[PDB]
């Protein structure tokens, strides 16, 4: 209960049965998608840091799509997820990045590309951290499919 | 209403103090079997290339089915896959293309 952790998710429900990319800011709160915040707060999709320390930050971001051949389209897709942090400095700082390309075969009908990445970084008080993607319109936000988290690792 | 065995019924869901039943928002979340959930389960909205076959109520989740001409197999439940049109040579077709199966060609 006196613990520093957080795992916020894609709103939009659940399945069947100077900074590159664009920031994801449609993440939201209280255990229903099964999110939570705990000694951290939110600020337009940026987690804000109370306790200065080492934090294992992570996010998965799912890319789902179908595709066609068109008159003026190159089909190559660069799916990159960025995890930046805003510090006391004017311009954001990229912390981690993970990328993938789509298949090339003109025979592709669809694309399923989920991207997990994470790692510990030392953050200070009031450091703000956010996820950021390319091909945003391709990101599926079913709530298990894409999320964003961090914890303190004392 | 009030609890019944420490359970709230479908459509409803329990409170923090554990004492009262609260009711899932309509076409937003749900609960179908008797529960002790502090939160209603969120509603599905048909991913693309599907059809909504029934709306998400309060005691039933929305139902999605593959588009017409696409199927959904057990091990590929993530994209609806296009039904084949032809069979190969020396092979003859018995069993049309359904929402859950490809076409079925024999010899």
């Amino acid at each position, epitope marked *: 209960p006196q613990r520093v952790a957080a795992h916020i998710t894609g709103t*939009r429900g659940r399945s069947n049965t100077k900074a590159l990319g664009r920031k994801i800011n*449609s993440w939201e709160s209280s255990r229903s998608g099964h999110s939570f915040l705990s000694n951290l707060h939110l600020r337009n999709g940026e987690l804000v840091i109370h306790e200065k320390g080492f934090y294992y930050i992570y996010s998965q971001t799912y890319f789902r*799509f*179908q595709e*066609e051949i068109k008159e003026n389209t190159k089909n190559d897709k660069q799916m990159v997820q960025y995890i930046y942090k805003y510090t006391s400095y004017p311009d954001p700082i990229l912390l981690m990045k993970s990328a993938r390309n789509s298949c090339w075969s003109k025979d592709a009908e669809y694309g399923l590309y989920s991207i997990y990445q994470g790692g510990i970084f030392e953050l200070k008080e009031n450091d703000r951290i956010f996820v950021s993607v390319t091909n945003e*319109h*391709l990101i599926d936000m079913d709530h298990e499919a894409s999320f964003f988290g961090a914890f303190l690792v004392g | 209403s009030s609890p019944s065995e420490g359970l709230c019924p479908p459509g409803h869901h329990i409170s923090e103090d554990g004492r009262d039943c609260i*009711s899932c*928002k*309509y*076409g*937003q979340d749900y609960s179908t079997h008797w529960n002790d959930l502090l939160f209603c389960l969120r509603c599905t*909205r*048909c*991913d*693309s*290339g*599907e*059809v*909504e076959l*029934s*709306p*998400c*109520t*309060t005691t039933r989740n*929305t139902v999605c089915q593959c*588009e017409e001409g696409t199927f959904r197999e057990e091990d590929s439940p993530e994209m609806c896959r296009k039904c084949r049109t032809g069979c190969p040579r020396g092979m003859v077709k018995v069993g049309d293309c359904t929402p859950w199966s490809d076409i079925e060609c024999v010899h």
Partner: antibody
Amino acid sequence: QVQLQESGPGLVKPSQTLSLTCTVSGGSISSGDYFWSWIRQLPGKGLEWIGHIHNSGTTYYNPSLKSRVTISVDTSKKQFSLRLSSVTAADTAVYYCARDRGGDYYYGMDVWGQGTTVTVSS
Amino acid sequence: EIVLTQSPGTLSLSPGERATLSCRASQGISRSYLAWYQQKPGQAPSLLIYGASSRATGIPDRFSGSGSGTDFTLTISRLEPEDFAVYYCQQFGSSPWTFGQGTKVEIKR
């Protein structure tokens, strides 16, 4: 058959709260079906979906309208009401109320009111 | 937000000639979640096509809907002079429910 009446002030004052109400004739809101809904249309261009409400009193709003918006029902009173907040120039527009068949099999608005044109000034 | 993009802005066509209206969504969306509206000057809109390709009650067969994924098409076959309003698509895909800028069919006399 089923008809809708845009009742409500055609004027509201800069950063005061706009309000309107919709009336229902022939058949009643109650009936666990449709979503009673507010659409505005912004000086001769795009329609904007504001938010809708169900007969169980549960709402749905357009995020970007960073809750200024509230909307409600009274089946005993046969009307649903919208209220913006804090309004300005960018809130001046015709405001339709309408009945969307949530999935009671369509998805889409089969019934509209004629919609009142609201102007925000003092 | 999912963005619909109606092409083109306007169309001029004499009666009898054939009208193809495009509506293309920034992300692919069901199909159950695409509907078409017609809005005659000084009227509230009214529902033409629902479910990408279903005629609302009362709508003349002259009107048709097609498409899926991101590309959706509304087709008016043999134009009457009435049919010269403005036409909107909207998507109940996800959410805000959104509308396209709209395509305006103008008569040719």
